[PDB]
Amino acid sequence: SFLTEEEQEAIMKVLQRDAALKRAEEEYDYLIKFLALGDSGVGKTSVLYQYTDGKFNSKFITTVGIDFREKRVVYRAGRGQRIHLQLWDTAGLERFRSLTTAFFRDAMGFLLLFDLTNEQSFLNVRNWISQLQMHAYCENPDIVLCGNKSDLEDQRVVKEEEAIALAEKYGIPYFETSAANGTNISQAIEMLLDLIMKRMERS
Amino acid sequence: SFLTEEEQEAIMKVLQRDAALKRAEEEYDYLIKFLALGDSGVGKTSVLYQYTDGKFNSKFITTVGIDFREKRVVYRASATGRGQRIHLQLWDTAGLERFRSLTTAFFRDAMGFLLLFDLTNEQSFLNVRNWISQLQMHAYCENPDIVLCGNKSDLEDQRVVKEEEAIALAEKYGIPYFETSAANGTNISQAIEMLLDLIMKRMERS
Ligand SMILES: Nc1nc2c(ncn2[C@@H]2O[C@H](COP(=O)(O)OP(=O)(O)NP(=O)(O)O)[C@@H](O)[C@H]2O)c(=O)[nH]1
Ligand SMILES: Nc1nc2c(ncn2[C@@H]2O[C@H](COP(=O)(O)OP(=O)(O)NP(=O)(O)O)[C@@H](O)[C@H]2O)c(=O)[nH]1
Ligand SMILES: *CCC(=O)Nc1ccc(S(=O)(=O)N2CCC[C@H]2C(=O)OC)cc1
Ligand SMILES: *CCC(=O)Nc1ccc(S(=O)(=O)N2CCC[C@H]2C(=O)OC)cc1
Ligand SMILES: [Mg+2]
Ligand SMILES: [Mg+2]
C-alpha cells in the first residue's frame, strides 16, 4: 500500500485515457503532444485549465501523478491545418517525480513553469531544463519559459530581465503568464506549437 | 509502500539510459522494443537475463520499478530469410502492484509483450487473465502481439499448472504459448524469436 487505491486508479484512468486517444489517432490530421513541468504549485494545472476552458480555480488541488487535457486547434503561420492537442500536466512533487519524468519522453514540446512570486520556482528552472534534455527522446527539445502568476504584480519576486537573461542564455522564449486571467497563456502555447511544427524541417 | 527516494534514483537512471538509447536511433536497422509483464516472482528479470547473457541467478532480487536489458540480434524472416540487424530493448517491469502505474506507463513504449506466469504458482496463472485486459486497455496498437510463457519449467516437481489449461487459454486469445525456463534456457530464445517474428512481420504490412 502506502499509495491510496483511489490515488492509483486515477493514474490508471489517466493512463487508460491516453491509450484510447492514441489508438484512435492511428486508426483530425495531426496530433501534437505538449507537456507542462515546473515545481509543484507554480500553476501547471491552473494554466492548462485556463487555456483549454478559460476557467480558473483559486483552491489548490495538487495534481496526483499525471493528467492531461485536450483541445482542438487550427494552426496558421496560407492554409488551415487541424490539430488535436494533448497537454500533459505533470505533478510537480517529489513523490511523483519518477512518474512525471517518465512522460517527458512522449512530449514534442515542453512548457516549463515557474511562479513569478517564488524565487525557488525560478531557481529550480536551471535543473528542470537539464532534466528536460536528459530525459527527452530528441536532443534539442523545444521549451517555452513561463513566468506564471503575472497577475500578482503585488507579490512578484523574479526580476523580468533576470528571467529574460536566463531565457536568452538557453535560447528559449519567455512569457509572463497569469492562469488567473489568461494573460499570454494562449500566445505562449501557440508559440510552442509554432516551434514544434517548424521542427518538421525537410531536407 | 510509497517509493523510497533511493528507489527513485534507480528508476530514473533507467529512464536516463532509456532516453539516451532513444536519442541514439536518429543520431541497427530497426529499433524493436518489447516489454515483460507478469506477477512478481514469475521470472521476468531472469527470463531476460538468460536471454541477453545466457546467465541465471537464483536469489530473488525484485525489480525496483522498471529496468531494461539490451541485445543486438540478427533477425531473419520466416522458406526464405535475409538477415536484418535488430536492436532490441527488453523492457522489464516489476510485478508488485505498488509499481503498477509506473509499469503500465510503459505499455506505450512496447511493440510486443512477453506475458509471464509461474508454472509452480497457480495464482499467477489465473492473474494472467487480468494482465491481458490490462494490455488491452493500455497498448497503443491494439490487438498487441503477446507471447504467453509458462516460466520455471525446470521445476517439474514443484509444478502445479496443467499444461492443458494453459494451451487452451492461449488459443482462446490466439496468442503463442511456450513452457520456458529461465534456469536452463529452454524455450527462452524460441519464444522471444516468435515475438520478434510477430512484430517484424507487422512493421511488414504497416
Ligand atoms: N493568482 C494566481 N494564482 C494562481 C495562478 N496559477 C495558479 N494559481 C493558484 O496557485 C495554486 C497552484 O496552482 P496549480 O495549477 O494547482 O499548480 P500546479 O503547478 O499544478 N501544482 P501541482 O504540480 O502540485 O499540481 C492554486 O491554488 C491555483 O489557484 C495564477 O496565474 N495566478
Ligand atoms: N528454477 C527457476 N527459478 C526461476 C526461474 N525464473 C525465475 N526463477 C527464480 O524465481 C525468482 C523470480 O525472480 P525474477 O526472475 O526476478 O522474477 P520477476 O518476475 O522479475 N519478479 P519481480 O516482478 O518482483 O521483479 C528468483 O528467485 C529466481 O531465481 C526459472 O525459470 N526457474
Ligand atoms: C523532438 C521529439 C519529441 O520531443 N517528442 C516525442 C516523443 C515520443 C513520441 S512517440 O509517440 O511516437 N513515442 C515514442 C515511444 C512510445 C511513444 C512514447 O512516447 O511513450 C509514451 C513522439 C514525439
Ligand atoms: C504497438 C504500439 C507501438 O508501436 N508504440 C510505439 C511507439 C513509438 C515507438 S519508437 O520509439 O520506436 N518510434 C519513434 C519513431 C518511429 C517510431 C516507431 O517505432 O514506428 C512507429 C515504438 C513503439
Ligand atoms: Mg497540478
Ligand atoms: Mg524482476
CATH code for position B19: 3.40.50.300
Q: With an 8 Å Cβ cutoff, are B3 and A98 in contact?
A: yes
Whether B110 is in a domain gets the answer yes
Length of chain B: 206
Residue A26 counted as domain residue: yes
Residue A5 contacts B, CB cutoff 8 Å: no
B8 vs A98, A103, A104: nearest CB: A98
Instruction: Give the Cα separation of B124 and A149 in Å (integer).
Output: 51
In a domain, A138, yes or no: yes
Q: How far is A60 from chain B (nearest CA, A)?
A: 23
Range of the domain at B113: 7-200
Residue B106 within any structural domain of the chain: yes
Residues with Cβ within 6 A of ligand 4?
A: B 22, 31, 33, 108-109, 111, 139-141, 144
Cβ A11 vs Cβ A64: under 8 Å = yes
**Inside any domain, residue B1:** no
Q: What is the Cα–Cα distance from B165 to B119, expressed in whole angstroms?
A: 11
Residues just before a chain gap in chain B (C–N exceeding 2.5 Å) are 27, 78
Task: Count other Cβ atoms within 10 Å, centred on residue A117.
Answer: 18
Report yes or no on B23 lying in a domain. Answer: yes
Number of domains observed in the structure of chain A: 1
Biggest distance spanned by C-alpha atoms of chain A: 55
A178 domain-assigned: yes
CA B105 to chain centre: 15
Experimental technique used to determine this entry: X-ray
In a domain, A29, yes or no: yes
Q: Find all residues with CB under 8 Å of B76, minimum gap 6, and list them.
A: B82, B83, B84
**b/e for A29-59, b at 16 or more Cβ within 10 A?**
ebbbbbbbbbbbbbbbbbbbbbbbeeebeee
Q: Distance of CA A80 to CAs A29, A75, A123, A198, B178, Å?
A: 11, 6, 40, 15, 52
Neighboring chain A residues of B18 at a CB cutoff of 8 Å: 105
Q: Over chain B, what HEC string results?
A: CCCCCCHHHHHHHHHHHHHHHHHHHHCCCEEEEEEEECCCCCCHHHHHHHHHHCCCCCCCCCCCCEEEEEEEEEEECCCCCCEEEEEEEEEEECCCHHHHHHHHCCCCCCCCEEEEEECCCHHHHHHHHHHHHHHHHHCCCCCCCEEEEEECCCCCCCCCCCHHHHHHHHHHHCCCEECCCCCCCCCHHHHHHHHHHHHHCCCCCC
Task: Sort A177 into a burial class: Cβ within 10 Å, 0-12 / 13-18 / 19+.
Answer: buried
Residue type, A56: F
Contact call for residues B175 and B149 (beta carbons, < 8 A): no
Instruction: State how far the alpha carbon of A54 is from the alpha carbons of A47, B44, B59, in Å.
Output: 9, 47, 56
**Chain B residues closer than 8 Å to A95 by CB:** 2-3
Instruction: List Cα–Cα distances, A13 to A21, A23, A26, A93, A106, in angstroms.
Output: 12, 15, 20, 20, 17
- Report which protein residue has its CA nearest ligand 3's atom 11: A106
> For residue A83, how far is the Cα from the chain centroid?
17
Q: How far is the CA of A44 from the centre of ligand 5 (A)?
A: 5
Q: What is the resolution of this structure in A?
A: 2.8
Residues A2 and B99: beta-carbon distance below 8 Å = no
Q: How far is the CA of B143 from the CAs of A19, A89, B182, B203, in angstroms?
A: 13, 29, 27, 14
Long-range residue pairs from B157-161, CB within 8 A, at least 24 positions apart, any chain: B158/B120, B159/B119, B159/B120, B160/B119, B160/B120, B160/B121, B160/B122, B161/B117, B161/B118, B161/B119, B161/B120, B161/B121, B161/B122, B161/B125
Lookup: cell for B169: 487459454
Unique residue bearing C-alpha cell 497577475: A151
Strands A30-38 and A109-115, by their bridges, are parallel
